[PDB]
């Protein structure tokens, strides 16, 4: 065992990019109050329907619009009982992975006092079957998350097109939906936490589901309500039935479209947890071979360089356990006030 090899180096560290991890479950927690935003939305706004609106000989228009509607509301339960779930399933298993650190914790500083070479072999390649496990959550989390956003993005493209073109239609009826959409897209600005940059507070404020006329619901941060009055008096306004007709899909295709900007902000930020574990397991089979190396050594202290770095991964691991629980608690507290 070198000199260098004995130097508590990068390559291997016990302790995952705790800066650069800790952004990571910030940024997945921003993303799950914007998703459960969009899916409350979704699910609660109006059918929308054609029955008296005149489409001008756009006959299959009405039926397009409806199952855009459909095909984004079965998004949004994927994302609520299938994604979110994996989400949270690889956010346990840091807490895990921190559990048996810990569990490991003292067994390991004994070993390395008393020159135990064998437990200390065990120790680490228990842990490196963990993290090895952890690469799977991650990458099923990953794969999950671009399976989510590839489907949607197919819906968002098509239910865009009609979209414009029924704009087209009531717009060409004298309706005055190029400025409500605008209005309507400025007001639904304020839950789209996942844009946000910068501990977890972002994730205490309220989101309230506000009526607006058509029986449409807009989620809006309870922060925010000053700032939007101005907006929110605008569309609280009685409006003509075709502006009224263009809200419900305007608010549909944004929730939809919004989600799949954010699926795919996440699969660029979310990625990094693939990475820290597949470095980790690298590290760790570092970390055998200096423990295998030194163990020829006679000297009593031959394990004491391993020391330094097993503290700090200690603590490090503590930190971000401690978070990933506080964020997995965000997340499953994570509600819109009607």
């Known amino acids: 065992l070198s000199e260098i090899e004995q130097t508590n180096n990068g390559d291997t560290a016990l302790s995952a990019n705790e800066a650069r991890m800790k952004e990571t479950l910030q940024k997945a927690g921003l993303f799950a109050k914007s998703m459960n935003a969009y899916s409350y939305m979704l699910i609660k706004n109006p059918d929308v329907n054609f029955e008296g609106i005149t489409i001008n ?29 994996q989400l949270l399933d690889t956010l346990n298993g840091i807490v895990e992975y921190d559990t048996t650190f810990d569990n490991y914790y003292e067994t390991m500083v004994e070993a390395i006092n008393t020159g135990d070479g064998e437990t200390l072999k065990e120790g680490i390649t228990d842990l490196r079957g963990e993290i090895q496990q952890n690469q799977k959550y991650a990458q099923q989390l990953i794969e999950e998350l671009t399976k989510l956003r590839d489907s949607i993005g197919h819906d968002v493209r098509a239910f865009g097109s009609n979209k414009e073109l029924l704009q087209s239609i009531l ?31 972002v994730m205490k404020g309220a989101i309230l589901g506000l009526p607006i006329i058509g029986g449409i619901i807009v989620g809006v941060a309870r922060d925010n309500l000053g700032k939007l009055e101005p907006l929110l008096a605008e569309l609280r306004q009685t409006v003509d039935y075709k502006v009224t007709l263009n ?77 990933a629980v506080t964020l997995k608690e965000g997340i499953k507290e994570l509600k819109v006030e009607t």
Do not use: C
Request: net charge neutral; proline share 1%.
């Open 57 to 85: 000989g756009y006959v299959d228009l009405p039926g397009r619009i409806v199952q855009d509607q459909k095909n984004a509301r079965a998004h949004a339960v994927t994302w609520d009982t299938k994604v979110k779930k």
């Open 171 to 201: 717009k060409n009826q004298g309706a005055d939906v190029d400025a409500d959409q605008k209005r309507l897209e400025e007001v639904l600005g304020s839950v789209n936490y996942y844009k946000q940059l910068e501990g977890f507070n």
């Open 247 to 323: 809200r419900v899909v305007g608010v549909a295709y944004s929730n939809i479209n919004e989600m799949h900007k954010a699926l795919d902000d996440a699969i660029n930020a979310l990625t990094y947890m693939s990475t820290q574990w597949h470095d980790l397991d690298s590290q760790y089979s570092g970390v055998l071979g200096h423990i295998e190396n030194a163990a020829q050594k006679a000297d009593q202290n031959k394990f004491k360089f391993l020391k330094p770095n097993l503290n700090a991964a200690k603590d490090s691991w503590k930190t971000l356990r401690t978070d």
